[PDB]
Structure 1
Amino acid sequence: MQMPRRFNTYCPHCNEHQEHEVEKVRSGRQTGMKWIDRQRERNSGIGNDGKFSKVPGGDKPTKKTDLKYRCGECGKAHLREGWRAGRLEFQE
């Protein structure tokens, strides 16, 4: 489906309808310093490493909508439940 790059809607921050802008969420980069990271290095030794010896799973036929909603005025974003969509194209 196609979707407007900008449109009006409620801004949970301002508490009033403003023109928001939609962007597909870009994955942040990791620091490899979280607690989970430490445990990996800490609990991995000789032989099988339990959980840390597993590999990434598979994928669902279609992914959900992973968007960010930016408020034209205050400039703060907010998230929304997503919906399965083979592809998502923005309009303008």
Structure 2
Amino acid sequence: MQMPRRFNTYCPHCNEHQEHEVEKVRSGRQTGMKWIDRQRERNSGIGNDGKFSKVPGGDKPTKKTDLKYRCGECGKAHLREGWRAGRLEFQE
């Protein structure tokens, strides 16, 4: 489906309607320093490694909408529930 790159809507921060810009959430990069990272190294040894021996699940036929809504005046963002969408394209 199509979707406006910018449009007015409520800003939970300003607490008043303003023009927001919509961007797809780009994945942040991992540091490899989180607790889970240390447990992987610590708990992996000889033979099977339990949970750390598992591999990536799979895919749902269609993914939900993963967006960031940025307030055009205060510059802060907020998230919303997403909805299943085969494809999402912005207008302008």
Shorter-chain TM-score bucket reads: over 0.9
TM-score by length of 2: 1.00
Q: How many angstroms does 1:44 deviate by?
A: 0.2
Q: Deviations over 1:31-61 (max 9, x none)?
A: 0000000000000000000000000000000
Structure 1: which 5+ runs fail to align? Answer: none
Q: How many angstroms does 1:65 deviate by?
A: 0.1
Q: How many angstroms does 1:84 deviate by?
A: 0.1
Q: State how far apart, in whole Å, the 2-side matches of 1:69 and 1:89 are.
A: 15
Q: How many angstroms does 1:29 deviate by?
A: 0.1
Q: How many angstroms does 1:90 deviate by?
A: 0.1
Residue correspondences, number: 92
Structure 2: which 5+ runs fail to align? Answer: none
Q: What is the aligned partner in structure 2 of residue 88 from structure 1?
A: 88
Q: State how far apart, in whole Å, the 1-side matches of 2:62 and 2:38 are.
A: 33
Q: How many angstroms does 1:25 deviate by?
A: 0.2
Q: State how far apart, in whole Å, the 2-side matches of 1:32 and 1:42 are.
A: 13
Q: State how far apart, in whole Å, the 2-side matches of 1:64 and 1:2 are.
A: 15
Q: How many angstroms does 1:62 deviate by?
A: 0.0
SS at match of 2:61: coil
Q: Identity of paired residues, percent?
A: 100
SS at match of 1:39: helix
SS at match of 1:7: strand
TM-score by length of 1: 1.00
SS at match of 1:36: helix
Large movers: runs of 4+ above 3 Å: none
Q: State how far apart, in whole Å, the 2-side matches of 1:89 and 1:30 are.
A: 27
Q: State how far apart, in whole Å, the 1-side matches of 2:20 and 2:75 are.
A: 9
